Design a protein around this ligand. Structure first.
Ligand SMILES: Nc1ncnc2c1ncn2[C@@H]1O[C@H](COP(=O)(O)O)[C@@H](O)[C@H]1O
Ligand SMILES: Nc1ncnc2c1ncn2[C@@H]1O[C@H](COP(=O)(O)O)[C@@H](O)[C@H]1O
Ligand SMILES: Nc1ncnc2c1ncn2[C@@H]1O[C@H](COP(=O)(O)O)[C@@H](O)[C@H]1O
Ligand SMILES: Nc1ncnc2c1ncn2[C@@H]1O[C@H](COP(=O)(O)O)[C@@H](O)[C@H]1O
Ligand SMILES: O=P(O)(O)OC[C@H]1O[C@](O)(CO)[C@@H](O)[C@@H]1O
Ligand SMILES: O=P(O)(O)OC[C@H]1O[C@](O)(CO)[C@@H](O)[C@@H]1O
Ligand SMILES: O=P(O)(O)OC[C@H]1O[C@](O)(CO)[C@@H](O)[C@@H]1O
Ligand SMILES: O=P(O)(O)OC[C@H]1O[C@](O)(CO)[C@@H](O)[C@@H]1O
Ligand SMILES: [Mg+2]
Ligand SMILES: [Mg+2]
Ligand SMILES: [Mg+2]
Ligand SMILES: [Mg+2]
Ligand SMILES: [Mg+2]
Ligand SMILES: [Mg+2]
Ligand SMILES: [Mg+2]
Ligand SMILES: [Mg+2]
Lengths: 326, 326, 326, 326
């Protein structure tokens, strides 16, 4: 009954916007549909495999990475709403030509879950939208803002069905892509996460590198002190899929710093901040274990950050352990 | 270049078949496409949620469960190739009317991964095909055959893309559904799994219930005695997704028996046997920890069985632990 | 490379618009995609047959008529860009609620070519957009403007492929719907019709009712006085299909007044005017035989008008006959 | 409820076939779906325009002609059911390699209605299936059989929706392609044409070349001697579209011989015979004006034939005129 286009229009309607943000979101939607279309038939299009390069964060690039990146970049430019773009696939920030230059700064992960591409596991796209604060000409510094400054954030999940999750000041809403008419349709309004869940999500293969706090927390999930039923475990391996499940089912998702990674693995700008924003707007929490992810002022567009997010009571319980060990 | 229909035709061509098996597989394909179509837009069709009942294995039934079950049952009957059908969603075996009765017995899980439906995580369909051995009229007993008697087995995975994996005496082949023309296209021929992988897949939330062998094995994956890099962990929560990843990336998938479940959770007839068959035809192994899954003679169409499967060297290493503890 | 959304955005960009017209066109596009989707599978949806009523212009209503009408009406209202709507399927003009009221008046034929629905012949949707000129509250009178006052007009043709043809002051552009991503893509820019064609389109079954001018013209197309090759004949029976062919191939389309129909059959507001506008913006002509269609000031929202349109030299030759007989 | 695959299977079931005919039809269906998919987005794929050559019947070849021809040829060969193939796009008959050689001879028009491609008017595919009668090795002579020897015939119409019309000894059935699941679904069973219609279909641009019989008949359709209402006229310009409308609405379709074309324009092997067969199985008639189309023994695989077909009473009335003039 309600398409994403109508929702965004009516929302900007009340926000008294000028339509620039509206255009931005609409363009982002088009890119997401094209990505979804290619993803659902990637093997037939021979889009699996490596492209032949490595990014700044040291990662083997895939064909879909390139395709999805080109699609997002091009639609964002043509939107006339952006001035600075930060992509996981690009060493430096992309400065938009004066002509099509807008007032928004967009940070995105064109295709998240690369390790799961070839095995057909859910993958997605992550984005964060900021309003240019500086007065100087557009530059990389304009993307170095704390997550708390986000005006919009979300992700597209290409799972059993394709979903676009959009978070803004008013809340989180979920839209599902109807492949037949090529429109995202509202299916979940003002989503709120459960106060406490029963699932913990983490790669336990790093057990030997985990700090005592994460170690203690996991042990508590398996052997509850109150003799309650142990939490179930889930780790798809694609941040977008694990976070979405955390959002709708509740629980906790973790990619903590460890002995070999002081700042964890996930990227602050286009992975952690967007999910932290979605999570907080849904009544959830997102922390590094010592500080709120959204309060971090970045100094590098590709910097990493540890991230623990999900149901408030679960995240808080883990925070109490870090404090107890601190 | 090669559709599933052509492959199956040319294969039965050499098998000197009469076309009954061919019809069966073609009908099964049609059901899978319809399921895939509904799955990709389930939320819009309002197919999420419970149907309002519980199966024999004690599980809350979902709307998609009913829809997918009806689709498979109906296409199998109309195929004129089956006589006995066993579904996870049906208390007793379904006996096909004399008119449309064929010589095949089909055991299937119309929709696997129910716990992951609402959160858009990959789900699928699993099937096993047997040739009626008895001489008596068709009955439930005809489905009580050991996996080693399988003539065909496989699964449909509704992940980032939809894939049909088919295993027969000649080997394992993967076909991807092209949504545009509605045809499954061969994308991976004679698939073989790696001798040794680097990923272990298990729900560690049951840590308190695991036997000493599984416990020791997991500890070894996290803290390798040869100081090699620890294995990475992955557990999507949908058997079809975890097994498919195990098939293409290698490694091990486990759903062992535990203190509260002597025979594990997964069902022998329509979950364990099919995956055990696919795995063995790909050069992999499938064991309960004490015996080959395919060698189990079932006494109940809905009986459970522990299952450990994947790369031969990984599965064998776990088997050595069970034997060491035995 | 260029979607309809981008084109309309960049065009309104230069037009210095406020975005209301842009929203209107985008909403109209969504309705057209939904209609196209239903049309391509109408028989399966059981959308063929009659709905059970007759319109003011005395015509048996079909199921698709109702569905397509509801879709256009609803998207136009939700666009926040319209105040008065005129549909072939509605006795009186529809006045939009103050809340979602905009400054545009839209006249449309939700589904043109009803006689060709059941036989799968091309059908379409026709629309004309006017800017409210009155100062009074919105009413039917606001739709009683001459075609020359059109700000935008066009049609969607559901033929071998689905095309959206949009004409505005700057010219005529054609966009084709890509079923895979659900986006209209620019395929023909600034379309111009040939000065002279070689095809005449008319229902010759009315031969006994035609005036001497039409009669003489047809005879000339079959037996050219200069001994040139006779014109070929084409009459699909759906105005949208015949006019589109006239636009791209050139020639003439005719639905003249006759002994039993002083004002012909086609409706001025939502059939003749839009096509007359598209035709004139493409360098073509549209006449009743005695006056320019676009210069007619209507007195009834459902009034009819004779229409002769197409290549200038062909239409002019017919006009010379009417004048010769006058 | 009933897919084309099931229908053909159950029909061959009763026919006691060996499955070769079944395979043939299934392969033909796959080609038709692929063609339909390309057609619905031809402009975006840049499939419009000429390929760069002329066929034996002297016609400018289009890109879609080549693509559709390659698709049909390849699927027919891979079917293992054919030995001799005759295509409008091929100078000589195609002899199938011994390996994939079957017992059927297929004559087809891969894409009919070329003149209507660029203007998005309905187009289609036409096919006729014969059983090899000769005992010698497969050759062109095996395709030189009279239409009355047809075992199956039909066409795919890519109109507002895509329809596959299949005629066999038991009757005519219509299947509509559901783009979502990529399956043809039965929508019209045992179709029968009306005894008398009210529409005549012919290119009147050839008025100066028509024989006195056709001339007299047209005059009678416009000025009925019994003062009944004149017949309506329709001529889409694509044989597949005009014949399908004739089949479902009744009436008459004509492409007669004329002063410059003793044998008309349409091709006997892959245009006239198939439609003549469909028409006769539906209770209709197909004549050259002097003899039954199906009784013509061809001497050239690309020979032409005049054709008058449709409702028995209409075709008979025209036959009475030819006889009256004879
Ligand atoms: N579609 C929308 N939904 C929600 N808030 C919006 C929307 N459009 C604009 N806004 C808000 O209005 C501000 C200015 O919008 P704009 O003038 O389009 O750049 C944005 O930064 C948002 O805070
Ligand atoms: N399409 C096929 N692919 C592989 N093996 C086949 C196929 N069709 C038949 N077979 C083999 O031939 C046996 C008899 O086939 P059928 O006569 O169709 O029941 C089956 O049980 C298989 O072992
Ligand atoms: N997308 C557009 N393309 C072309 N002209 C436009 C567009 N948007 C607005 N205009 C022109 O600007 C006028 C005012 O637009 P608006 O303020 O959106 O109602 C319209 O009546 C058109 O003449
Ligand atoms: N699917 C079918 N529908 C109708 N008739 C069929 C079918 N299959 C076979 N037949 C008839 O049986 C004959 C032999 O079929 P086959 O052995 O498959 O070549 C054909 O020439 C038809 O007359
Ligand atoms: O294999 P690991 O170390 O658990 O990394 C998984 C994480 O990496 C990412 O693929 C990013 O590279 C995330 O999508 C996912 O959460
Ligand atoms: O939540 P658990 O106990 O890990 O169960 C997960 C397993 O259950 C199933 O959903 C079957 O019920 C499998 O698809 C999956 O492997
Ligand atoms: O059957 P007739 O009188 O030629 O009418 C055909 C015309 O009628 C319409 O269907 C409108 O009713 C047009 O689409 C078409 O041009
Ligand atoms: O333009 P003409 O001479 O009427 O030819 C139309 C006929 O030609 C064809 O395109 C075949 O060439 C048929 O599809 C159609 O019936
Ligand atoms: Mg990522
Ligand atoms: Mg990425
Ligand atoms: Mg299951
Ligand atoms: Mg199940
Ligand atoms: Mg109309
Ligand atoms: Mg209408
Ligand atoms: Mg033809
Ligand atoms: Mg042709």
């Amino acid at each position: 009954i309600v398409t994403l286009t109508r929702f965004v229009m009516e929302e900007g309607r009340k926000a008294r916007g000028t339509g620039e943000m509206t255009q931005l979101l609409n363009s982002l939607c088009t890119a997401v549909k094209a990505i979804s279309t290619a993803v659902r038939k990637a093997g037939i299009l021979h889009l699996y495999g490596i492209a032949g390069s490595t990014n700044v964060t040291g990662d083997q690039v895939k064909k879909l990475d390139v395709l999805s990146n080109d699609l997002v970049i091009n639609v964002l430019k043509s939107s006339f709403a952006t001035c600075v773009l930060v992509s996981e696939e690009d060493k430096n920030a992309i400065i938009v030509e004066p002509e099509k230059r807008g007032k928004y700064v967009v940070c995105f992960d064109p295709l998240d879950g690369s390790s799961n591409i070839d095995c057909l596991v859910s993958i997605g796209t992550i984005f964060g939208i900021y309003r240019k604060n500086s007065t100087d000409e557009p530059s990389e510094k304009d993307a170095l803002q704390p997550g708390r400054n986000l005006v919009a954030a979300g992700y597209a999940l290409y799972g059993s069905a394709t979903m676009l999750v959009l978070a803004m000041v008013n809340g989180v809403n979920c839209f599902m892509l109807d492949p037949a008419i090529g429109e995202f349709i509202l299916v979940d309004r003002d989503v709120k996460i459960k106060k406490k869940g029963s699932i913990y999500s983490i790669n336990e293969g790093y057990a030997k590198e985990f700090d005592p706090a994460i170690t203690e927390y996991i042990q508590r999930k398996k052997f509850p002190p109150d003799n309650s039923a142990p939490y179930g475990a889930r780790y798809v391996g694609s941040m977008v899929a694990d976070v979405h499940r955390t959002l709708v089912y509740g629980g906790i998702f973790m990619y903590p710093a460890n002995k070999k990674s002081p700042k964890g693995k996930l990227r602050l700008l286009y992975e952690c901040n967007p999910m932290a924003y979605v999570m907080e707007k849904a009544g959830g929490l997102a922390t590094t274990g010592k500080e709120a992810v959204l309060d971090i002022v970045p100094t590098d567009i590709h910097q990493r950050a540890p991230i623990i997010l999900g149901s408030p009571e679960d995240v808080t319980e883990l925070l109490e352990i870090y404090q107890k060990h601190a």
